[PDB]
Design a protein around this ligand. Structure first.
Ligand SMILES: Nc1ncnc2c1ncn2[C@@H]1O[C@H](COP(=O)(O)OP(=O)(O)O)[C@@H](O)[C@H]1O
Ligand SMILES: Nc1ncnc2c1ncn2[C@@H]1O[C@H](COP(=O)(O)OP(=O)(O)O)[C@@H](O)[C@H]1O
Ligand SMILES: [Mg+2]
Ligand SMILES: [Mg+2]
Lengths: 398, 402
């Protein structure tokens, strides 16, 4: 009877093989067509350590080259992000990475990981990446790798004609899922992987559900006792891209797989976001218990993890239970927990509903101050993270 | 170098070993907080298949006894769910297993599975379970096993209704890994009192899931590497399903978006396969890749495996007026017809309200909006459930022998 069933499933596979997924078509149907909110002169001045005189001089220098800015009959300006990066390049700012002693720097590889789903992990990741990409004084080179096959990071930072076609994911690069005749060159990685977003300096390596096969073709393969699978992501992707980025951030998902193991091995920093709820905190501490027993099995040439941080998410701040849970986090493993939380606001629910960040939204989408406070909270969290990255940076170069 | 990091991690885990997870406290904080919407003679007839005369005679018999019914603002009676279950055995119609026409049935082990998340398989599972439980005439003994560590099937107003006098509450993964007190043995009574919990549907029991269960995969990752045995797929069927089949007509396993050794357990234990897939394009393509991968996995299973008996693709979130989605649905029906189910599930706002309120379309009323939309949604769910029931009654005697 087993024969009949296996025959029937093989028949289903043969009947349905004819349909394949066109990734370009999927990305095209998921086009952004929303136009990132343009910045006024003051918003430009706050996102970029620039005085009004320097900004006016930059506008003059760029206008002398023919480029025409967008202002209204009362000289209110609507500066796009591209114009904002050009104003920095046209202002003489050394643009962090091009200046001294930081010119020779080992890039940060941050792994956002937790065993519980429904804690703002995937959302904290995109918000952190965007908010760091909005520091126009430094203009960090940021890469966001969606390592969750069920991830939607390709929808929040939508990648981009029909002559730079066929986009491969991280897993695809791990399995050499490429034309048999192509090289693993960095220009290839720059061209049809690591696609640009509505932010000029922030690239995303998108994920697709078909990536899940990696685990299936590795769970059965684990009969071979390899325990070298963890080297795949770092040896096949990161080392080929680390020359181009200052910060790489990896969004994994709520599980423990060979893929999440790759994310752990390639990482040199670990970020653990967890909601201030009792169930989420208990699952996170079970994750804590589990983490070292697996990290030991990693090969000796690991030497990873410069620092580890717990990021409280969805903090209600009026709920006695949630504040008590946060105080427990602070008492048990303090200073390893972050001092900047991310609140529960209707703003982030709107973000999830519209597949965008609070920085892609406008004040007229719902709630006036309720968006300003959300953006300021995300900025405080990103600033604390930046302070931690700068503190532990020289220790990362060796 | 990394020695200091691993010592730091061990100190992180030691600093926090004190905080445990009280799975009784969290199910009590998740109490139902409301009752099932009572039925008013009409729903009773439609669900029970009873004539108005027989129903009235039975309720008048029950009223002359110590029991008294209850009406609403209008004198029409407003009977609850358990009151209707009592009406059933107090009307003459036996339970499904009580009917001597089939008393040695191998129960259905239906496995809902697809390596694409967000295609609405969990909602399909909970609604199928609730609707089949609402067949008051036959009163199937149904068990909904949440095998998704991130599953919330206990939440969907399927509350593990249990008085505060019950010691613990274990998941299916806990029973598989023998994660119970040391002295006790896993008998049908232990599973009955600590594993399968009441749901507010008298004929439906639920096995809960918790995020900690995720670590099962680790318990296999080192098993599969240092040992090429593949005997972990037997854990679900042998440690739980076999010791539990004596109490259920139907068992539905909700799995999760992955293909894992836990999903392997769900596949090995199943005798029926449901593949819900949304009418979206990339959903259909990922389900097709899943199809391509499936037989190469099932072929690795041990030689003691009595097949699958049937497979059904369940379209979900169908938008009815979307040209791309209707094209995809017609492609699904054309390529593997007779194996794709006819009744689909719309993209109704009623299911959005369900996901917002953690309920089923049979639990909430018209006031939660709409109105006609909920009626059409629950009618569609009932139609799909009747189709699956007709399929089950067909292929049943095929596996009653094996
Ligand atoms: N800061 C926040 N405030 C309010 N709601 C949030 C916040 N972050 C996340 N959410 C909600 O919780 C859900 C968690 O999303 P996600 O981060 O993808 O979870 P996970 O990372 O566990 O998959 C989202 O759908 C969103 O609606
Ligand atoms: N018919 C429907 N109409 C509207 N929304 C739906 C419908 N069916 C499912 N959904 C939405 O899709 C989501 C699917 O959730 P879930 O079933 O847990 O994912 P998975 O299918 O991966 O298990 C739900 O949150 C629900 O809000
Ligand atoms: Mg996520
Ligand atoms: Mg699910």
């Amino acid at each position: 009877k087993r024969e009949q069933t296996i025959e029937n499933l093989y028949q289903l596979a043969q009947l349905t093989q004819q349909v394949q997924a066109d990734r370009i078509e999927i990305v095209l149907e998921e086009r952004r067509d929303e136009h990132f909110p343009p910045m006024s002169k003051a918003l430009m001045e706050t996102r970029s350590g620039l005085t009004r005189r320097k900004l006016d001089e930059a506008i003059a220098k760029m206008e002398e080259a023919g480029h025409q800015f967008t202002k209204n009959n009362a000289n209110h300006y609507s500066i796009s992000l591209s114009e904002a990066h050009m104003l920095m390049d046209a202002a003489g700012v050394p643009k962090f990475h091009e200046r001294k002693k930081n010119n020779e720097n080992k890039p940060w590889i941050i792994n956002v990981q937790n065993q519980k789903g429904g804690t703002g992990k995937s959302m904290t990741a995109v918000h952190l990446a965007a908010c760091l990409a909005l520091n126009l004084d430094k203009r960090y080179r940021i890469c966001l790798i969606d390592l969750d096959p069920q991830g939607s990071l390709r929808l929040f930072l939508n990648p981009q004609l029909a002559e730079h076609t066929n986009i491969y994911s991280a897993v695809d690069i791990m399995l050499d899922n490429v034309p048999d005749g192509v090289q693993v060159d960095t220009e290839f990685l720059r061209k049809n992987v690591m696609l640009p977003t509505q932010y000029p300096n922030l690239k995303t390596i998108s994920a697709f559900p078909e990536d899940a096969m990696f685990n299936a073709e590795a769970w059965q393969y684990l009969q071979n006792q390899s325990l070298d699978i963890v080297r795949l992501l770092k040896e096949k992707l990161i080392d080929k891209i680390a020359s181009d980025f200052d910060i790489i951030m990896i969004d994994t998902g709520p599980h423990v797989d060979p893929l999440v193991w790759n994310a752990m091995y390639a990482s040199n920093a670990l970020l653990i976001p967890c909601a201030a709820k009792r169930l989420d905190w208990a699952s996170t501490v079970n994750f804590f218990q589990h983490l070292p027993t697996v990290y030991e099995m990693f090969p000796e040439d690991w030497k990873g993890l410069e620092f580890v941080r717990l990021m409280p998410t969805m903090f209600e701040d009026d709920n006695k239970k949630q504040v008590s849970v946060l105080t427990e986090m602070n008492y048990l493993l303090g200073d390893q927990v972050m001092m900047a939380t991310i609140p529960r606001s209707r703003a982030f629910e709107t973000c999830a509903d519209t597949y965008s960040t609070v920085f892609d939204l406008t004040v007229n989408d719902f709630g006036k101050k309720t968006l300003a406070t959300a953006q300021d909270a995300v900025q405080k969290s990103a600033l604390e993270l930046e302070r931690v990255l700068h503190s532990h940076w020289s220790s990362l170069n060796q």
